[PDB]
Amino acid sequence: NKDNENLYITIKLLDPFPDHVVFKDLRITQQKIKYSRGPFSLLEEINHFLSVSVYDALPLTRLEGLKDLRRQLELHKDQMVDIMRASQDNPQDGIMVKLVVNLLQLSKMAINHTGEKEVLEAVGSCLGEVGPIDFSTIAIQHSKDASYTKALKLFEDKELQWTFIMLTYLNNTLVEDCVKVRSAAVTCLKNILATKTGHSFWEIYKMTTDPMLAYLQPFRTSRKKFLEVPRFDKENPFEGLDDINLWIPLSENHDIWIKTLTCAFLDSGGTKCEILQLLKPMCEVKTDFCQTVLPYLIHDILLQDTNESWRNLLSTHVQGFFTSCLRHCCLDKKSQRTMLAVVDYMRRQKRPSSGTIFNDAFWLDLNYLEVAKVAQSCAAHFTALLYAEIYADKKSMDDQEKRSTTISSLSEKSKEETGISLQDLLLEIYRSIGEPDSLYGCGGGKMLQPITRLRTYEHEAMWGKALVTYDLETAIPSSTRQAGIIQALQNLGLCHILSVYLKGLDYENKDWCPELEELHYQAAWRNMQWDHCGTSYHESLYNALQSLRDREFSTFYESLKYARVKEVEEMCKRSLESVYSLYPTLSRLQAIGELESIGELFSRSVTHRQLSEVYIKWQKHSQLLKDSDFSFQEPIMALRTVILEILMEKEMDNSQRECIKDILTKHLVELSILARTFKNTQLPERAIFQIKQYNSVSCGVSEWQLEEAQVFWAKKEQSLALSILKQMIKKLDASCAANNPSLKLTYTECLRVCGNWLAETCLENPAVIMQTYLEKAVEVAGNYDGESSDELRNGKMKA
């Protein structure tokens, strides 16, 4: 059926078949169908992958598409720079962050399903190909159906929108395996379609084109008299809902709680809309339907509320539920999310009385501080922030009305009234959000507390102050005290000091918590302490490195696979709302991918071309990370340095290890430059020392000496840098005689930098500086006639 025009579009979009001999003919048929228009670029491949995603929610069928996307991301990294540059103007809808979100959603869908390990591994590899690239966005957005939104916009009446939502849900659940659910859905569909509202929905909705209209044709029937929903007048409609036990049973049974609450709402006589009354059989078989319909039932009750009796009853019961959450009791993370969704839905509805959005935010008399605290507990950071702002505004308005206060005073009143500090809650909300600038907005609370000071020092990269405070303070729990001490020591270098400190800590303490084992393994693999010898990340990395040294590739790949799966699983259970929560995971997956990629090079023969290509790929991907934070780039550079040093320490009888030595020297120079950019001085010094371990001083000087001089200049040591650069210039003058094209760039750059430094320090007259350094560099760059190069052009431009 390749020639079929109505089936060609859907055949083009199906997932590629697995790479096997049996699937050959279908594979060529699919590739020629898809590539009939022409070759697809990286952006087109990503767009095709995302269009395929919306069809079937089964992760097993997407394994081949995941591998194909990995291949395109691996061999089309050049187009990723153009893709990111094209999304700079509008980073909210960036295709890369959308792809990452879709992959993470697919991984979440793969949890608790057969063949999940392969899907998680493929997703981890895909997220390892693209690292923690700065997406210029803070909030994670989810893809929404444009057709569904347009259909919602078609209906103006709220009841018609409710009818459309219920009918869409019933159509969606009609394909479920359960037969009782299908029967209930069919009965509800017939009941809704038999009412007058269903008929009006059909008349309004028949203009548009939608398969749901065709699916609902057999259920619809034409009758002279419209179906009448009986209305019963209860003697006291409030007795069903006025029960504190009914609202909070909380016996670790959320399904029966939501079912009983929905049934109690349904049997109440307050409901006026006809379609909601007929949803009881569908509600009694599905808890998700009950959770979906509960906000609609509450809204319908409040619309018909008279004398504010229902409003007061719902306000006091919801407030009691929220207080029972705050307590310490021990509620299920589903009930809180359902109530948060109820509050969010009610916040978007217009009240019958004329008013603004602020008035609409108070359908019920609720204390939004408690709701914000629950949302923060439920990891709804933006919702918690909005609720906290609403609560603060409402309390300020109430105080102004009563009288007819700063943040600290308002927090004190909140603490003395409800026991929750607004400033503290805003502090954890902003920390969870992770935006660096917002942390300074709410800092007046707990200023003298050592934890806040240490967090501020770590955020500002004040590692020395953090180490001093960690050593000084004792009341802080030990586990995080040595965790911070080790982190501060590592960030300042001090590898030998950190190793001795770890040895002494292990000597004085026998109990070993997982955090200290994690840090010990991190220091062991970072310091190449190979004599130390579920599994965690750094432990897996250390085991993989030892397997690489011992040429045990099977366990090396098994360990890398296990680490990738564990990282993806750990990322799946997070909230997935803040972009900053993805960066450590993306960096870890990138490091794992780089180690896996270099594994094949280590296994087979070592050649100059393969190492050059690997270094070029590393440099290109590092340039793709130019906007990433140093905390997400430093582990990658450390792993690259460890890998290169492991390659060099391998037995090398071919006498061609100079290529690896040069590659490591260039990598360490780039690391020194990157650390200098981020106002770091210990790491560039360590990199210079590592370079000097494998290198020496000869007649022909090299670039790392200039890098060392720049590092010494950055350390506010002007005399040392000037003396080093002057010695470099003297050696260049005595050595080269306009014969080495490679030394031309080094000589020109050294002369220009020395002249600029002398001009800045005012240690020499302008005449001598011009005669000796600047015009000399210009003459060297120009008169040598070593043209036809781009680096020479850049050097001449700078001079």
Next chain:
Amino acid sequence: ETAIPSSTRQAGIIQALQNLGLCHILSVYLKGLDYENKDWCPELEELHYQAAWRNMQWDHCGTSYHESLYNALQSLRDREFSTFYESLKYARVKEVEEMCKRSLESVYSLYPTLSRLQAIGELESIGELFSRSVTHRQLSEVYIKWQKHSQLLKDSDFSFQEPIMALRTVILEILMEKEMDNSQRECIKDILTKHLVELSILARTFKNTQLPERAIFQIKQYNSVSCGVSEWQLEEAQVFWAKKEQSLALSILKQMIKKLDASCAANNPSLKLTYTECLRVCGNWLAETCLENPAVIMQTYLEKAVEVAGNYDGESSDELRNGKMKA
């Protein structure tokens, strides 16, 4: 660097760690070094004894200087005065003998010896006070003598004054940790607080920030926050200001001012100086940071401090005269 000889490599590492505080880090580093190495050269034993007596690690237990000091401190704790005096005599004799064999041409070669002999003399002088009964007058006289001799050392380098202050702090803490059933240890607590405040000021003068923070922490260990604020809180605010943390120092000083305003009602002469100094310092800091208009700064801090210092009529004092002059 690794090619440097190990003995001086860990000697420099220990010296750098000690000069930056990091007492727990230095202790763990020493324990790990002793774990990984069995040979023990005299330099490392000297540094280990120095850290043991400086950190009050009393469970570690010819003789050298710091070893003699540590032995004397343990003898002081155990009330073994005969060996305490014998150890101090031996340390003094050894120091003089070591100074005799030097060239004796450079004045700078005498300063470490003079500082060590001063520390030995101070420990010997406080030994008699420890041996006999503890009284307020004797402690006051000893503190006055210490302050006068420290003022005699106002031009000395910090490297020659820091060990003396550390020994004084250790001596005071040893006096406080002694059993005290007379309920008059508050005098020793106040003396130690004043000594630590002076140490913080001296370290701040020499552009040192870790030692003032350690002294503030030690003060906070033995002190708390009450309705009537004290001077060490102002010293802590000054230390935080010296650490280029202007927001923290300003917030601390503002809290101090609010507590003073709510607590005192022109009734405590002692709190008058603290309130005036806090107001003047906060006003100067706000003026430097340009975080407030001149009208509000004058109305709230400067003229308020002047009014507090003048209208309270707590005259006939020299500290009040200095505070009024500064305001």
Next chain:
Amino acid sequence: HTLFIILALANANRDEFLTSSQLDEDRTEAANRIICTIRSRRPQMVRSVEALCDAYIILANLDATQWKTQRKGINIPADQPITKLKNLEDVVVPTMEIKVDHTGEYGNLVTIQSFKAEFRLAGGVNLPKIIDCVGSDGKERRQLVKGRDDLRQDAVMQQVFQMCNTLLQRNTETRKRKLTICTYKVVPLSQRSGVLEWCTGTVPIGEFLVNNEDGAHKRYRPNDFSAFQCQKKMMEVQKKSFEEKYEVFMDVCQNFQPVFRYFCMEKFLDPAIWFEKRLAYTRSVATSSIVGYILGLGDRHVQNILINEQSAELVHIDLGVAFEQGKILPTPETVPFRLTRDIVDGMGITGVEGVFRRCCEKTMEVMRNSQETLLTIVEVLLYDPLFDWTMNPLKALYLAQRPSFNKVAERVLMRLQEKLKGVEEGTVLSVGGQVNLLIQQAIDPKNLSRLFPGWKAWV
């Protein structure tokens, strides 16, 4: 990118043609020579663009004072030649921003197709006309045509804003924070008439806040003082003592609470989108305030600031007053920028603390690191013979109405250099200290009290 500028220079005196010093005639003759040189090889484009410019000038010269009370749209009279011209494939849209390519060939550019027959009017002293331009792609574009005003100063200010944007782009600290200045294309056509980009989807902050019919203050705080009452009270105390002005301003501020924070609440119901829009608004305000202080931007009243409905980013218009010429006004401006109660309230509960202060510090650091380039650009501007940036009594009275050049340029350059180096009152101030001083000066009620009531300090 150059034909319109040369034609505008050559059409300095075509306003009275259609309806001084020797440098003027020399410039006109040189512009005519350049036009003939361009027309030598491509005559159809030059003729078409000249006809379009003449049509714009004729449309601008139309009085159209009868439809002042009409806000539904008036049909363009058939006498205007702009209706006759259609399908100008050789004229790129002046309103749109044309990307610059290294190659000399320009292709696939959006060209003018036709113009709608209906034009709108905007409020003001004079009556500008809003016309719609249809491009080759068929997408309508709104253009504002202004008369009896000089638009070259606005174009120069837009160029400086573009330079500030480019400086902010190449620094990673501000590129990460996406600190940009909203810009609109200004195309001067003569010494008296011109055309400029109309910011679609934007509303004045004063229109949103203190509108008489459906203002935010009236909708959210009916019991508070009305905008008219506050304006009348401020105008009454104008001829009074400074203390009386201060106490009147405090009394008005007591009965006028900011409600600008509700813009994001009523326009962005999603908490994630609301947070993104609020962060973008705070970053835009901080960056615009720092840029305005660096350039000495003045007359930043409610009607001169536009806010985008879609992106919640402030747009600054009417940039005629700059280089601290507002301090020379009869009522001096004592605030470097507008940081009124509504502006701070719209930043969230944290106010100026947090994102606003850090962004201001980053922008000031970027400005300081590029002091030489900014000083060179300002030197280029200040010696432009056609740049009438100096304040004159006529402009001073027009701005505030109620019912040696070399020495001045050198003083302005010295003041700018002191600002770039952190010198404020003869002392060296760090970036944080300077930012704190600017925030304190902007939010000081005493400085706001002295300001002109038309600036609406209480708003």
